[PDB]
Structure formats: C-alpha cells, structure tokens
Amino acid sequence: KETAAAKFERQHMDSSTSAASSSNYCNQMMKSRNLTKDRCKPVNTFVHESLADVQAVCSQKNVACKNGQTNCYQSYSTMSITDCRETGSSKYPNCAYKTTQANKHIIVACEGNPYVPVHFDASV
C-alpha cells in the first residue's frame, strides 16, 4: 500500500509550480492528486518548494503537533504554499475549492529512516 511518506508527497507537494496560477488551481490539483475521488477532502495545503527542502524540515524546529505528537517540526523559513478549502457550493462528486496563496512556515510530522514528512500539520 502507499507509504505515509508517498502519501504526503501526493497530497502536499507541488514542486512543479512556484505558486497557484489561478483560482482553479485547487480544483484541478485536488482532482489530479485524487483527493476528491471518494469524498471531497475538506482542506488541504500544497507546498511549492523542492522535495528536499520540505524533507529537510524534519531536521528543523521540533514542536508538538496539533494532536500532541512530538514528532512535528516547523520550518525555519517561510515557504510558498497554497491553501485549498471547500467552497460553500462544493458537493461530491463536484468538489469545489477556494485557492489562497500564501508564504508561511510549515509544520510537518516525520517518521522513518530516512526521517521524512508523513503528515502536514499546519501552515503558520
């Protein structure tokens, strides 16, 4: 089955673009990354950075996750991110999202050897 690390990349990484280029970015990416296949994922963040730069966060500032786990890390630097959240009209299978671009620090949970992101916790 898909590993947690691979799931993180599919759900949260977009090294192919430097920022969201239009209001339809989230609609298209949520679909393309299969985040709308079985239900409309309510909220999601994409990170417009290299994979290595995001993986490196696992060696940056430790902080407890929202759920209390202690394997979370905040990036030292801000990153280009896109916030995706369902619009009021979103209704499966016609999932619909508001695209918001931002430059924020990220907080990720990490696991494994290599020690890599497995969950996106927050943009801050």
UniProtKB/Swiss-Prot annotation:
GO molecular function: lyase activity; nucleic acid binding; ribonuclease A activity; RNA nuclease activity
Class of this enzyme: lyase
Positions glycosylated per UniProt: K1, K7, N34, K37, K41
Keyword Nuclease attached: yes
Catalytic activity: an [RNA] containing cytidine + H2O = an [RNA]-3'-cytidine-3'-phosphate + a 5'-hydroxy-ribonucleotide-3'-[RNA]; an [RNA] containing uridine + H2O = an [RNA]-3'-uridine-3'-phosphate + a 5'-hydroxy-ribonucleotide-3'-[RNA]
GO cellular component: extracellular region
GO terms under biological process: defense response to Gram-positive bacterium
UniProt similarity note: Belongs to the pancreatic ribonuclease family.
Protein name: Ribonuclease pancreatic
Biological source species: Bos taurus
